[PDB]
């Protein structure tokens, strides 16, 4: 199985992870400009966002 | 300008945002080597998963 803990693994494999946890059509690539890194990075920054919407929003709409 | 959707917004904004969204007191730089993707890249990711197994938990807790 995988490793013990995620300790410094390359920049593929933690850009597959997040594209993975956003459900991506098989998307990345070999780029590497500051326009890469900044969808990227907005991207995952966006992910948490709607995730502390939504957790916020469902924990008082189901008390009732 | 629009009210709603950010997008496009330079790398030193979206690295203070992920960065105060993981506790810190703002931000700075969003720097643009490998070794500063690998580390931003992986925080924000982290902090997905933590806030998804969160969410997760807290419904099937008050699904009763």
Not at 4 to 16: F, M, V
Not at 17 to 46: F, H, P, V, Y
Request: proline share 3%; hydrophobic share 35%.
């Amino acid at each position: 199985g995988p490793g013990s803990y995620d300790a410094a693994l390359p920049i593929d494999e933690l850009s597959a992870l997040l594209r993975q946890e956003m459900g991506d059509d098989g998307g990345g690539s070999g780029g590497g400009s500051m326009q890469d890194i900044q969808q990227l990075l907005a991207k995952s920054l966006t992910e948490i966002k709607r995730l502390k919407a939504a957790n916020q929003a469902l924990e008082q709409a189901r008390r009732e």
